Design a binder for this molecule. Sequence first.
Ligand code: CLA
Ligand code: CLA
Ligand code: CLA
Ligand code: CLA
Ligand SMILES: CCCCCCCCCCCCCCCC(=O)OC[C@H](COP(=O)(O)OC[C@@H](O)CO)OC(=O)CCCCCCCCCCCCCCC
Ligand SMILES: CC1=C(/C=C/C(C)=C/C=C/C(C)=C/C=C/C=C(C)/C=C/C=C(C)/C=C/C2=C(C)CCCC2(C)C)C(C)(C)CCC1
Ligand SMILES: CC1=C(/C=C/C(C)=C/C=C/C(C)=C/C=C/C=C(C)/C=C/C=C(C)/C=C/C2=C(C)CCCC2(C)C)C(C)(C)CCC1
Lengths: 51, 122
Amino acid sequence: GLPWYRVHTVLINDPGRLIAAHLMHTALVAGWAGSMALYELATFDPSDPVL
Amino acid sequence: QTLTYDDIVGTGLANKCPTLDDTARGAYPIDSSQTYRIARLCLQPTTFLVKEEPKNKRQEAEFVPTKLVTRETTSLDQIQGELKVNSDGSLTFVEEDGIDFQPVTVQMAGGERIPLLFTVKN
Ligand code: CLA
Ligand code: CLA
Ligand code: CLA
Ligand code: CLA
Ligand SMILES: CCCCCCCCCCCCCCCC(=O)OC[C@H](COP(=O)(O)OC[C@@H](O)CO)OC(=O)CCCCCCCCCCCCCCC
Ligand SMILES: CC1=C(/C=C/C(C)=C/C=C/C(C)=C/C=C/C=C(C)/C=C/C=C(C)/C=C/C2=C(C)CCCC2(C)C)C(C)(C)CCC1
Ligand SMILES: CC1=C(/C=C/C(C)=C/C=C/C(C)=C/C=C/C=C(C)/C=C/C=C(C)/C=C/C2=C(C)CCCC2(C)C)C(C)(C)CCC1
């Protein structure tokens, strides 16, 4: 069977599932941006941009 | 003109004071031998400003604008009191009675809510 370190080689000759994995990576990265921003907004103090 | 309750209800105009023409720039004489009264005084706020808390360094705090969140519930009206003529000639109004307070909540940037008793009591 495939070793663990080779699981994603199944996409090498499957252009659609390659596009599906690339879409999921993109979805997760945009997801992260959104969540990081909301956590930052929930913790940012804007009352003093000097000190 | 002589509008009616049913003309006005629900429009937001019950919270507005009456107004005088662009052309009412005359003058009302005070017969010092005479006695007077405000038969109706109406105050209608149009902006609320709150002083901001300047940091320990400070430099100066300014009055910042705020969002009204309690609707057309803010005006003071039907206020009465006597207009005396003093001896140096000045006029002094002394409130007796009237709807002379409104609670009001406005909201500062960032989301802090600030209640206040908008009043001219006494
Ligand atoms: C961008 C991320 C990504 C994508 C698109 C894929 C895509 C794919 N994987 Mg891969 N994989 C990934 C990450 C990814 N994987 C990671 C990080 C691991 C290590 C766990 C694996 C392990 C893995 C195995 C072991 C196998 C695949 C397989 C596959 C294929 C079929 C789907 C499947 O069986 O999913 C399985 C994968 C998952 C269900 C990923 C689970 C990871 C979760 C979502 C992490 C969540 C952590 C948790 C919620 C913590 C939250 C925060 C905490 C504070 C609580 C497909 C090509 C299969 C395949 O075709 O083999 C040929 C297969 O057998 N992958
Ligand atoms: C765009 C980046 C990219 C892409 C698309 C790939 C894609 C691939 N790599 Mg390469 N590779 C890359 C970067 C990349 N690699 C880099 C930077 C390194 C150096 C670290 C390697 C080192 C490397 C080795 C040494 C091998 C591959 C192999 C492979 C293939 C199988 C991998 C697999 O199933 O993983 C499966 C992995 C898991 C199931 C779990 C891994 C969990 C890791 C250790 C921690 C996860 C971190 C976390 C998810 C956050 C993401 C990281 C961060 C950068 C965002 C696949 C074609 C394999 C191959 O050639 O097979 C033919 C192989 O042997 N790659
Ligand atoms: C018609 C020309 C054209 C255009 C405009 C694109 C555009 C793109 N391709 Mg390329 N591609 C083309 C023809 C084209 N392709 C051909 C002829 C092939 C061979 C069959 C490929 C094969 C190919 C592969 C295999 C991959 C791409 C990928 C990508 C995307 C990478 C960046 C990304 O996802 O941004 C981030 C995305 C966004 C900001 C969202 C944009 C959404 C747009 C507006 C599309 C909306 C829906 C639309 C109908 C989908 C089809 C669009 C088009 C890609 C056909 C990007 C949208 C990658 C991809 O899909 O990434 C996931 C990828 O893995 N392309
Ligand atoms: C330029 C930016 C960039 C690039 C090139 C990549 C590239 C990659 N990412 Mg994505 N990622 C990015 C930004 C990027 N990422 C961002 C900004 C986020 C949001 C935080 C993510 C979140 C993300 C997730 C959630 C996942 C990926 C995955 C992947 C890999 C998919 C292909 C594969 O099988 O690799 C094969 C794997 C390797 C070649 C391993 C490379 C190891 C890298 C360098 C990390 C090094 C070890 C890591 C630091 C240890 C973490 C320990 C920690 C748990 C304490 C590929 C290496 C997937 C993945 O790793 O699947 C297994 C996956 O699950 N990425
Ligand atoms: C989104 C977040 C999710 C994160 C996913 C989690 C990470 C996924 C799993 C990674 C764990 C990898 C472990 C695989 C490890 C494991 O499977 O090893 C054995 C494995 C043997 O592979 P073969 O080619 O024989 O294939 C057999 C197959 O059954 C493997 O699938 O070797 C490899 O994986 C090569 C890497 C060796 C790695 C060497 C590690 C040995 C260190 C031991 C000594 C420790 C220190 C002690 C001395 C002080
Ligand atoms: C579905 C849907 C929706 C929704 C969406 C959502 C809700 C999403 C979410 C998303 C999200 C929410 C996402 C996020 C993401 C995240 C991520 C993906 C992360 C990552 C992480 C990592 C990767 C890390 C790593 C690390 C660690 C952990 C430690 C330290 C070091 C490092 C950095 C390495 C809508 C309605 C719109 C539409 C329809 C459909
Ligand atoms: C069609 C349809 C449907 C659909 C659905 C769906 C599509 C869903 C989705 C879902 C999803 C898609 C999910 C998501 C989730 C995710 C998660 C669960 C994540 C989490 C994350 C996290 C954990 C993060 C964290 C962080 C970061 C990253 C940074 C900053 C900070 C923090 C820490 C926050 C239904 C069923 C409704 C039914 C009807 C029909």
